Design an enzyme around this catalytic site. Structure first.
Site, short mmCIF file in Angstrom:
data_model
loop_
_atom_site.label_atom_id
_atom_site.label_comp_id
_atom_site.label_asym_id
_atom_site.label_seq_id
_atom_site.Cartn_x
_atom_site.Cartn_y
_atom_site.Cartn_z
N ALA I 58 33.64 43.22 45.01
CA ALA I 58 34.62 42.33 45.20
C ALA I 58 34.93 41.72 43.97
CB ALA I 58 33.82 41.03 46.39
N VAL I 60 36.40 38.78 41.19
CA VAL I 60 36.28 37.54 40.50
C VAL I 60 37.88 37.08 40.64
CG1 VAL I 60 34.26 38.05 38.94
CG2 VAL I 60 36.89 38.04 37.84
N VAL I 84 30.91 44.04 40.65
CA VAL I 84 31.72 42.78 40.50
C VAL I 84 33.10 43.39 39.82
CG1 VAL I 84 32.14 40.69 39.42
CG2 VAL I 84 29.96 41.24 40.27
N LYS I 85 34.21 43.19 40.62
CA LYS I 85 35.41 43.73 40.02
C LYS I 85 36.16 42.50 39.01
CE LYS I 85 38.17 46.14 43.05
NZ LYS I 85 38.82 46.69 44.41
N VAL I 86 36.57 42.94 37.96
CA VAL I 86 36.87 42.11 36.89
C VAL I 86 38.48 42.76 36.59
CG1 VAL I 86 36.73 41.13 34.66
CG2 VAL I 86 34.69 41.72 36.08
#
Lengths: 220, 220, 220, 220, 220, 220, 220, 220, 220
Positions: I58, I60, I84-86
């Site tokens: 998912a 940020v 965590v997708k950035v």
């Protein structure tokens, strides 16, 4: 990789040996002749001119396999660890086989074709020397020959190395190196061209001008 | 790599064996027939003519698998360590499987196609011999066949080697070697052309002339 | 396109001229010599053996340009419309220029390189004859030479044609044709291989068998 | 471009001639034999089954050039404008030359090699028919042969056309067409596969379903 | 070149016709169905929405060749100059031939293969419409099919044009154009993506900011 | 071919116009803004600075198609024969169509994709200007985009020309030229780099030194 | 095609002009200097040494465009139809434009890059001379530069020709010719290598030996 | 490498198993149906006909994943070590996952696309069987699909192997082998063609004739 | 290899997880938004819908590096092992470095260029997600970007994997897989198309028909 100079010019070798990362010096009968000094004179001089280190190569002159073996012994008595160049002919091939049995390292020379070069390696030669510019000058493709020869050695006689020779321009040397040649020998004029560039001199000049402009001198 | 001569010419083999780095000699029924000597005569003679070393190959003549196996035993009784050439036909394939079980090494011969050649290797053949010039002469591509065959063996039956055969020009041999063939067999005329070049003879002559000019002789 | 036979064999020419769509016959000194008949005998015989039609080629023997021009006149006095083959050497080039000025059509022969061949065309030669197998045999690439030569003529001397020569296998002839050669000359053994195929004979046999099976005869 | 069916099946030809844009029908001895009707029966029937239009091809059976010419006259007496198929053999070539002189159009058939095919065109054949699947089945490359043949015709005998034949799968036909073949002949099973696709039937079904869903019927 | 929109959305067509350089609009049964208006309504509306100019396409629904010809007449009675889309099936092919004879221009549709497409052109179709995304979605290569099809039409039926269809992304449309497709039809979402780019909008905003900065306004 | 400078620098244009073979000068809003002179000032000045000859380009600023047409009229009132640059957006496309109808020549600008560029040409633009370095800088391939665009124009809108723009290095310009671009516009720094080379200066210096050495002066 | 010699050696030119099909002779300041004769002496001598026919080229020495134009007039007063070589610098470009306006044909020289070369052609130069070996010697690719330059002239300034220069080996000359160069200039050593081959001499010797063997002499 | 026969023909399998180096036999529902013997009969018979060694494959018939698992158990109860073929559908994928958990080896079949095939391998299938001729026949490229699939397995699911299936010609089998397929299954007609060549039979005949000529018999 | 679904559709995930061999599920803000459920609801539901196994991703939402780190902690508090997708922006890169130091695994997203993607990996990202269709739609090459990115990771940051995303057609997914992508995420429509083929359904139907025909039922 092994970088050689193709020359009998002792003074040039001394001067260029502090500049280039040399593995040694190669000679052939035309190069020796042009220098006018006999083998028992030039060879030790060349050996010394390199700081008593590095490999030497010189060529037999005899026409028969037996005669070539005898030439090899003469060469080895002058320089104990010298690599013996044998032209890749019928008798040369026989000589290379004999020298293999005697434990004397050989280079298969006067190579104008890939299969010819390979045969010299299969016979026991440790180096194989195609005459790149000779093949080019005579309407062939020196680079293709070298490319093919390298691949053949790699697949079929992997203990052997290509020692590319006979150059008129640095582009030829570059293409041999790009083709994978594990050794190469340069004449003096090509070697010198390979380290001298107008564009590089201009970049150096520019750096000095910029430095001067900011710091009021060209020194560090 | 394994270099063979494709011949029943005992005198030529003796002479050429000191020149070329030979792994052995191959024969087939037409080559034997042309020499006019029976197998129990030529084979030991050929073995001797190579200094009692190197590998020999000879071909079965029978039409059935069981007859081919019997032919193989006959061949082996003449030369104990001989490699038995079996044409890659239906019965040949069956024979090759039987000879694999009996521990007799085989070569799959008369190969005109890559898949055919591969089948002979999967059946147990240690060597596979495409007829390069036959394929070329009959409107195909001998080199593509060899190229495809070598790749097939490498991927699918890596214990087996291509033994390229049937040549009219050195270019064909060179292309087979460039394609990766781990063995090859040359007829005498092509082998001799492969070691004799006008350009090489001219380079040698030049060296002698330069040497003479500087040293007053052509010897070392 | 122009298909030639490379031969001095008058009987064979007669027999093969009803089979092949021939433009003519080419000769060279080795081919004439091997036939043992002098030029003033074979040439008219070869002309006749083709039904008094088609083009002939024959080669000069002299070493100087002037001598070659004189040879050309001698050849033209035997066969009025004969194309004169001139080896592409320094004197040959000069001769070709002289023969161009005199309106005598030439062929530039003994071509082992593409640039060499081009020069002969620029000098006025109407045909240029690379020795394909000679280049192959001697460690080069006869096909690449031919390919390069054709392109050079097409770009730089478009009035000139490649007449590909010197063959040991049909594959060579096929590749020259594929490369665009506008003329070719075949020796007899290669020509005959080019029209005889086991696979074709088997297809013809099959047709006869099928016909027989359905109609009770092999005739139409 | 010319699309043919390769068949002696008169009923199929009649049915398929309203579907396919046919130039004609080709036959050979195995196709005639398999249909069991003699030439003087099937040929006129095939001609009629196409609406009295389009070209026909049929093959000679004789072994000599003279006999083939006679077979051609017999064929022409059945169908006046029929193209005569001649196997490309030594005699076939001679026959093609004779039939050229007599103004009877020919097709050079049983072609397993490109050069072979070209010779038939140089001899006067208007069509050249390589056997694609036969070349594929026997370890070669049918597509490369066709490719090379088309190029040869285009460069060296441009009046002649490739008529690609002998197919087991549409992909073979497609590759011939992609190679530039100006004519082709399909057997019935391949032709049918070429117009019947599950994916296409699914796309049609979908259209009908969508139409029905919006308009309450499947008709326009 | 001919640019079409693939839609039954009259309002969108009106709005997009002042933006895009449209040659017309294409429809198919799913597109008509999704818009919910019958043919005798949407077609004249679509024609009007383009300023009474440009070409229209619509598809037959019948299963038999005769029924498809009747569907064509119905379509032509609504729009006099309309191009009739016929699925490339066996009956579709027969229908295309019949419509060719009647002088009604056709488009061969539901093309999932290159050969299939070519047959529709040989039969008389003026346009051939491969379903690019359908082929891609179902594990094939839409682009290769289109590439092959274009080449086939160019070589073998040059009066016919590829009208590439069925798109999910602009990259597919681009590749069809790069392959040489002389016509194309875009769905609305892909067409809109093809004229809207964040990078372009940023370049425009930048121009306005620079202008404003120098001249105190964003107008000329 | 048409060589432009991409600049609002009137003094530089005057100086460089005697050196470069210029077809004209291009401007865009950032280039005009940077120069700080309004359009009614710089444009006539730029026209004069080229000797009252050559073509000029300038860009619209409005957001709507109508507003862009009005901008075009304003531009044309300043320079009668000016080419009007229109960003290739939805409204820009509509504007380009309107300007085509009004006979005012346009250039489709701010092109970041090939299909985009093509749409502008189909709409009537005579020039299409991809932003090469912008595409490069933003992670794409400016050269590929240009290559694809040129091909699209040549196949699908052959009246239109690529005018390659946005450069940081001469390599980019070279690659656009190699890709076939019929026009190009260079910023000043890249143009100046394209005519100034250390290697060239060194060759010239060498010539002067050699001349001096032989003739005692550096003049002719 | 135009073949030139790159030399100020009058005696060599006279001797080589009966051998090679020369279009003329090219000179540059280093070649003139090395020969030690002033322009007003060598140029007429070179013109005479070619039989008063063929084209000459010579180079300006001045640093400003005006000075180069004046140099050109001086050169033209010595040889009326001489082509003026102008180094492709900023001032050289301006000079080329001026000389174009005055109707004096120019050659753009000292070309180390393709774009540079193109600019000289767009400025009006009729020939463009890249320094092949200089580019090769200095770490670049002379052949790529020539290849790219030829393509640029052909696409963008088709009235102009490449005149390839600066060679150390025939292979370089061959590759330039293969790249499509419409003119070339060779130094004497390379030209001589291009017509002298050991393989060719061996083929000639063989012909003489065969002739002698059959006819008892080596003459025709 | 693993060679299979694609057949339910027990007698043929017995006969061909002494000839070919077989790893086993594959079946599918059409092949079983055509042989008319039920699974509990043919499977043990096929196992026996191979000498009680080698692998067998047979296909599930159920439509749901659960039903397919049950079919697998039934197949395994007939032949304990049988590989279970599962069509690569949504339910088939689920079944393959379930069978992986149960330790029953599977083959993913009815593969028309590379991604589809890969998914079956990721799900746990040990073999993946594309239908080569089905893809070809339906206007795709069987070879490209196989090539792509093999590469996907090797990179992304290396425990899995391609088992190439569905053939009409040996060329297709060859190309799959060249693409790296680690297993293959041949129908009987293709397998027989792969070992029977006219050219090979002619070479064998020639050997017998030469032998006879020299030795008065055709036996060894 | 790792196969993901790109979705917030919990019911679909549950259903499709028994079919596809899934490694997990990926989400982004648009996919979450479209599903209308907040993160603290959908994420656990998605985790459950996969049988409490597999990886989740998912994204940020914050604009600053610090804010992104805080978003990451919030995401990790919902799903402990979540990746965590950035977005790969300046701040994103800084965030990725910070999250690397904190031991939280990251994915570098919104990648439109290869170098951009590589930087995210060098910064510590374990996955890099180029938006394939976005790049395609916006006039670039998604496939080239992916190909280049994969190579960059492999050479320069080998701990990192490409996770290819953003698809409108299976062909795009196939080409990413062929390029070597070690992970991929598919939207639902593309995933479904990847397992459903009309040709495959027809092959299955055919098998059932053949079975029925021989055995009187469609079951095993």
């Amino acid at each position: 990789h092994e970088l050689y100079l193709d020359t009998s010019d002792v003074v040039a070798v001394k001067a260029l040996s502090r500049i280039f990362p040399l593995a040694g010096v190669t000679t052939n009968p035309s190069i020796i002749a042009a220098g006018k000094k006999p083998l028992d004179v030039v060879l030790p001089q060349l050996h010394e001119a390199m700081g008593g280190q590095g490999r030497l190569f010189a060529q037999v002159m005899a026409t028969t396999a037996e005669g070539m073996v005898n030439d090899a012994l003469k060469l080895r008595s002058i320089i104990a660890d010298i690599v013996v160049k044998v032209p890749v002919t019928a008798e040369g091939l026989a000589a290379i086989k004999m020298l293999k049995a005697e434990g004397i390292p050989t280079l298969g020379t006067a190579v104008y074709g890939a299969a010819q070069g390979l045969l010299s390696a299969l016979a026991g030669a440790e180096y194989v020397a195609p005459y790149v510019n000779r093949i080019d000058a005579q309407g062939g493709s020196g680079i293709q020959t070298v490319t093919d020869l390298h691949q053949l050695l790699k697949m079929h006689a992997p203990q052997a190395k290509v020692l590319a020779a006979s150059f008129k321009t640095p582009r030829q040397a570059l293409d041999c190196l790009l083709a994978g040649c594990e050794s190469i020998t340069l004449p003096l004029d090509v070697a010198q061209q390979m380290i001298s560039y107008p564009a590089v001199d201009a970049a150096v000049a520019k750096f000095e001008q910029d430095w001067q402009g900011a710091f009021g001198r060209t020194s560090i």
